[PDB]
Amino acid sequence: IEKNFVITDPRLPDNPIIFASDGFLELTEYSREEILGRNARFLQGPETDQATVQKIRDAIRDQRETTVQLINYTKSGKKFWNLLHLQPVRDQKGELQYFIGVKLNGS
Ligand SMILES: Cc1cc2nc3c(=O)[nH]c(=O)nc-3n(C[C@H](O)[C@H](O)[C@H](O)COP(=O)(O)O)c2cc1C
């Protein structure tokens, strides 16, 4: 499986992270207890381009796969480029269940 990914549940308030891979915890410097249950926007900060955040918001609204790149921050404030791939996960009836978010490659 992908080294660095999270899964969110959009059927819970504010689309919380319900799983974060070990590689995601290592890169972001947060513990599982600091990540589970919150929206992934906490990785954004002052240099994050709001035009890209808007593209993400639109892709989530329309429930479409997309790939964007935006500046994120580790727990200690280190900036990193996140080439973020978002994938909706649907059931057999076509109903949205989860989103997968993969950080593609990278530093
Ligand atoms: C599965 C998934 C993973 C996400 N991962 C990140 C991420 O790693 N970094 C980030 O800045 N935003 C990430 N987001 C985007 C935010 O959670 C949020 O959708 C975005 O900031 C736009 O919504 P808002 O305007 O309410 O903040 C992710 C979203 C989803 C659904």
Author numbering: 387 to 493
Report text from the authors:
Flavin-binding fluorescent proteins (FbFPs), engineered from prokaryotic and eukaryotic light, oxygen, voltage (LOV) photoreceptors, are promising fluorescent reporter proteins. Their small size (about 10 kDa for monomeric FbFPs such as the improved LOV (iLOV) protein derived from Arabidopsis thaliana phototropin photoreceptors) and their oxygen-independent fluorescence make them ideal reporters to monitor transport and anaerobic biological processes. In contrast to GFP-like fluorescent reporter proteins, whose absorption and fluorescence maxima can be tuned by exchanging certain chromophore-constituting amino acids, the absorption and fluorescence of FbFPs and other flavoproteins depends on noncovalently bound flavins, whose structure cannot be influenced by mutation. Using spectroscopy, X-ray crystallography, and quantum mechanics molecular mechanics calculations, we provide a firm structural and functional understanding of spectral tuning in FbFPs.
To elucidate the structural basis for the blue-shifted spectral properties, we determined the structure of iLOV–Q489K. Tetragonal crystals (space group P43212; one molecule per asymmetric unit) grew within 6 weeks and diffracted up to 1.45 Å resolution. Although in parental iLOV the Iβ-strand is constituted by the residues 482 to 491, Iβ is shortened by two residues in iLOV–Q489K and ends at K489, followed by a kink in the subsequent residue, with the C terminus pointing away from the core compared with the parental iLOV. In addition, the C-terminal end of Iβ becomes detached from the core (in the following described as unlatching), and the last three C-terminal residues lack detectable density. Interestingly, D491 and G492 have undergone post-translational modification to yield a cyclic imide structure (succinimide), which we speculate to be an artifact of protein aging. In parental iLOV, Q489 forms an H-bond with the FMN-O4 atom. In contrast, in the K489 mutant, the introduced K489 extends away from FMN and forms an H-bond with the O2 atom of the succinimide ring (K489-NZ…SNN-O2, 3.1 Å). Collectively, this results in opening up of the LOV core domain, which is expected to result in the influx of solvent molecules. In fact, additional electron density is present close to FMN-N5, which we interpret as an acetate ion, likely derived from the crystallization screen, which contained acetate buffer. Aside from those differences, the introduced lysine adopts a conformation that is facing away from the chromophore, which, in light of previous QM/MM calculations, accounts for the blue-shifted spectral properties of the variant, that is, due to the absence of a direct H-bonding interaction between the flavin and the introduced Lys.
